[PDB]
Amino acid sequence: YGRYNCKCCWFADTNLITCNDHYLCLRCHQTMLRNSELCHICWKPLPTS
Amino acid sequence: DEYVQELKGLIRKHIPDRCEFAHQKVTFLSQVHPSPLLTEGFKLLSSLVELESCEAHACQANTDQRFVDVILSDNGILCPTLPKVIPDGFKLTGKTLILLETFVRVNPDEFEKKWKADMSKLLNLKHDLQKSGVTLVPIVDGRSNYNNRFVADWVIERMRWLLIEILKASKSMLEDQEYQRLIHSLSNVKNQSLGLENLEHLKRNSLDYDERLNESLFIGLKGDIRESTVREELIKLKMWFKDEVFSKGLGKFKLTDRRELLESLSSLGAHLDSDVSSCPFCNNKLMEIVYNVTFSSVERTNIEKHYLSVLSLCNKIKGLKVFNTRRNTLLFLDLIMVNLMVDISESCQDAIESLRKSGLIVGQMVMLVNDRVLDILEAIKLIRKKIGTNPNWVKNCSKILERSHPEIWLQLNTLIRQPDFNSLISIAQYLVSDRPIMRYSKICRHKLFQEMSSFEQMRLFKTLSSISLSLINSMKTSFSSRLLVNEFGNVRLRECYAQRFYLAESLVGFLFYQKTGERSRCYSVYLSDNGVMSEQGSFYCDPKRFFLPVFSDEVLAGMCEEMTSWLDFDTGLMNDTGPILRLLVLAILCSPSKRNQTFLQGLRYFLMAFANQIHHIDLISKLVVECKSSSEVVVQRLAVGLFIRLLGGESDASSFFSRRFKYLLNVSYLCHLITKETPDRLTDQIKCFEKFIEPKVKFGCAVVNPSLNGKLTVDQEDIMINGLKKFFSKSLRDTEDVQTPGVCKELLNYCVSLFNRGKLKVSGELKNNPFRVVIPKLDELGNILSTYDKEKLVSACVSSMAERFKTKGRYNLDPESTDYLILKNLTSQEELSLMYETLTEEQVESFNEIKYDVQVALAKMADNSPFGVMKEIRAEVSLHEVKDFDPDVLPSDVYKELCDAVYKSSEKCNFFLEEVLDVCPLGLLLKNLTTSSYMEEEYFMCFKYLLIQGHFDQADKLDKSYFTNAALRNLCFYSEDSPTEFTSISSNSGNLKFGLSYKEQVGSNRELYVGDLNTKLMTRLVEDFSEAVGNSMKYTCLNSEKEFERAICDMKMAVNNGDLSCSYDHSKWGPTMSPALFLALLQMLELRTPVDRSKIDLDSVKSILKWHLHKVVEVPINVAEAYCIGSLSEEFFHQTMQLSGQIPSHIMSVLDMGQGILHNTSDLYGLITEQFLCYALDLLYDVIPVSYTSSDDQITLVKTPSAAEWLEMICFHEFLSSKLNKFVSPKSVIGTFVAEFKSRFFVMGEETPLLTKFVSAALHNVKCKTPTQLSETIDTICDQCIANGVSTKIVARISKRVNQLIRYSGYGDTPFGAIEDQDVKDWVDGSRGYRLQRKIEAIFYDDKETSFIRNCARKVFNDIKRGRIFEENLINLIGRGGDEALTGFLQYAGCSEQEVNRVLNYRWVNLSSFGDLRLVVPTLIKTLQSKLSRSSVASGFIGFCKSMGSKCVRDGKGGFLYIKEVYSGINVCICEICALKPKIIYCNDSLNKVSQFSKPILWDYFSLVLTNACELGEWVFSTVKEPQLNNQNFFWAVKPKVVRQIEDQLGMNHVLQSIRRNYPVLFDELKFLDVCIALDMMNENLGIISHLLKTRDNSVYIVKQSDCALAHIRQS
């Protein structure tokens, strides 16, 4: 993996689920689940649990 | 005394033809003594060239060599008490006279510095001689060798080749510094090697001044501090710093507090102090009129073209100047137009209503000659007045258009048709409406722009286009063009200039204004729906800032919809942020100003300060600019109203921060649409000078006039030396006086001494050692005719005419044969206007003064009642006259207007005449030429001529005969100013001048120093020296691309890796540092060359930056009189008025380094000192930094062990960096998310696209020479705009703006033209050479006509390759021409005659057929010479639409014609050949009358196929296959993948295959290269080798997946 901050929102450090090729927060996980299941940063599907 | 016998017989071969050489030689032969031999027998060679320039021009040489004051007193002329000069040749007659001086030089370096001194010495003779009542004509004669006619060029080199020993023998047998400059003057043709050793062999004398320099300038530097003593200093310093000055709060950085900034920005921007309105349209004045147009007409004919045809004949009939003035040649074709108007009134029942209010005449209005609305009835007064003044006016001018005239006319009867005044009143009484009113000097209803549907907003930009085009060609009007009626609340408009602009199929609008020119106007716009006029307002602007929108609805709506579509992650946010961007985009274009440019620039500093983590403390006190008017607030509520909207809401409004960043940075660059022009230059130079002078008198150093050659007085010196030791004052541990110039000398000691040891990452190793026309004056830069040209070409024209009527005795000037001389050498009645209309107003107002003083000179050439007191002579006439000293420079603002009418209105005397007499004999112009404006309506120029008429302008000497510094003026070729003995500060010759200018950058004015000719030569040495020094360094990146690339590759991987990367900048990095600092650095360097490991001497550099310490910076002359009329620079002047009151024209300094002079010599200083500071953090804060520098920008990337706890590092770095006067501007930002470097903003995980610089640069840079050259630059910038992945659609719509601006330019169309549309993959793989194939194979859309020429290309190309010759002698068959080379090749490959029948009938009309399109050998030679050898757009587009409709296309016979005459010379050929694409492809039968222009298109299609086979592929040949969803905003990077079938390294191989092409063309000027070099030399449209000698130069393309899966495929 790369750097240890969030790929989307950049300003969170703890409790991060390792997605496909990028870090990601619990806050902005939910503002992508309602739009799609396919992501819009890596354009590849992400873990569910 | 060994050649003393030879010399008298050597020069016996010059016959004393006059008295000039006869007394010279009889005192030569009678003196056999070398003590006067080399003075008096040396003064004949100066006497010999002196006769050549007096035999050349009209002249009488001064054989007495005496004064000017008594050469006028041999005539009866009273003594004027002139200054004292000696002229070297004259010619006097009447009350004018021709001075000529004479001097010959060899090198360019000290030739122009005699021209500039001689010309300044002669042009400061007029001011006592203008008062004498006489004007003179000055000339100079530059000679670059000895080219006499009276000798035969074989004896003069024997003189200087045998007198070159006689002075060495003369001063060895028997004065010091007057010797070797005489050698360098008497030396041969000097192709002289000039270098660092040129300084080395002079004298190096002293003054007992430079010791007081070194007493402050080298003292504390020892440079050899031990490397274990510095650590014990540094730990104490940090321990002092942290406990002393940090914790009591003096640090420059902080922790950014991300909530306070958004409250700070709302209080910054939303001007709740101001009282502006909420609606945007109400406040601005042009959006008002746009809203009135777009909702007065959106909610909702053979006589026409006959009228247009005869009016378009009236246009060409005006431009002749045949009717002896410019007044009746308006009224005459006025009479013609009004008779032809009433000649339509008698034809139909309804024509003047149904077809004339529907077109060209509104209520009581008429359209005619220039663009003039004339509004009938005043003509009826003026025409009746004209027939009243002359009883029979149309009886001679009725058909004076036959004799001395064209006599090609179509005016049947309207030449002679006397208009029945009793007939026009029926028409004039028929249509009457309210006359046009035009405003000078409260409720709202505007439908709330966010609440209008998504279609009619395009009807705002569409109307902005149509108004803006009429703004643009409101320059096209003639600039001379005085009206017929001359003369501030609200004015009803009698007649005016106007444009027309169409909106629908019934109605037009209008655009009324009074002034012509390029300056600001005061417009008004009406409508005309079906005959009814309706006013809609008045606004006030300047035209030339509105080039941008001119055809660009679809551009400005493709990028504002490209950009909004980025925000498909929050739909409810998108439908809000959409229509609030668009009003912004509209409002910026509708208001170009500096203030609403600068504020929009200042938001990219905010934005890095909101994503990153530490800003400088002073930034919010710098983003503010005072809104001077109530229109800069409308933008400063909607940008800020956008930034509060989507940066941070009170909730978690940071879902996808990256697109917010991209989308808002692209708003901060959306600034750039305003045209960089600095709207007026007399308010620009004052800001430039005032930005220069402020950091100087604050430190207190500026001086007045030095002597410009060495010496300085003591009082002038002491302020210099006090500034010097105040510079090096700066004790190391005081927190006061930290923002102050200077260097801490004890710390620079450490900085250079650790560099001596090899412990920095740079080291003093230094591979491959460095030790190996019109020229302006310097007080006015930015202008295009300086003072010195403008008398030079005048005096040259005076001499060129003064002889040509004394060759025969004409003694009369033709008033155009005197305007053929100037108007040629600055840049037959049709020829003059053919090259008169290609000027600019800036040159027109110079040309008129040239016409003035030329004709005044010629009027003075031939010559040998004040009781009109209505307004008094006593304090009005004589007062302004003596205050201004010329009649020439008179202003108009001391009087009223009507006195200009009435003091003109004295009756005729001997001051006037009648019968204006275009023969114009000489000796009468002083009374003839004033009548030319007595009869024309204008008055003021007649006032100036009537004022200029009536006299209203009022043995020791044998020791001294050898060249002493008093005996300098005895020779012309002495070369008085040669470098002989340089000093510590000067070079015995000059004082290293400079000059002022700005640079017209985007936000703020960058300055720019103009150097003179020696100054550039002495600056190249230091600059290239330090370039070689920094060549061996490791971390600079200014000139090396590769290290810059490594830094970019580092920053990309390092933001992805959790580092802390700063981004600094430096406020006034230019004007702060000092040349003495570079002296104090080069004292203690080593620079041991690895060839000979030794400490080299840099005294060639150490003695020449001392010169750079002491430059003489001039001042602009426009600010020498702008502060003179009426602000701390003005305070600085008006405290130097209280001294001895000389005007302050020369400023020696201490601390300049103007930007671009010592440029690379500070790039290593910003690398040496940067690495020293980079070492101070490896030892005091256990990290590992690395620090690039581009001489103005830095980045120091830091790893940390194991989050902004270590502010301590950064602030302490700031405190050290302030100790070397590298100050850190408050613009900088340091954090861990964003880093810039030279505007390439490198976010986490990506690169930021930055769309809106490329479009905004592509809509500009429309430069106009030929309409294919103009369709090359925009193809290049469309290659760059797709290098960063915009889309296809915006590229596909720049390519219609550029297309229609050509179709608007009269050109018609051609199959090449602008580049294609709907082009998708041909950006990555292939050049303009690939795309023109796709343009031409788009015509043959069934693709059944060009597959066969590709079949022929397959049969030729597999056989013209290797392994086979098969006519490699085809170099001749192409050179036949274009019509029959294809017939050669095709029947070479083989088919019937019927294929040649069905191929050669396709023809395109060429216009660059024989020659090229003329608007005042192929392009291959002029391109290859460029590998061999080494004003606004919107006023440069009108000269492309004025000199293209004129006589501009040529045949092979000598002459030119029109385009329409060619395009009238064509038939109609409906039979399916022309109906393929109309007006593009023709038949062969339809080009029957004009058949010398029809070339085939199939010839160039085969030409492109055989070029692209050379450069790539074997897939130029295949059938184009049919192409094959993803999200709109997933783009990724691609590479070229081009399969090249040549071998590389073509940097020389092209010239050595031009012997085997054309011997005479190489005379005057591989494996497959040569077959596609004659396919380029025969035409112009191929362009092959400029894409082979270089490379693709991007190779890194990024493309959208939905622009990459949609593209086509051509495999093999």
Ligand SMILES: [Zn+2]
């Ligand atoms: Zn997030």
Ligand SMILES: [Zn+2]
């Ligand atoms: Zn993703």
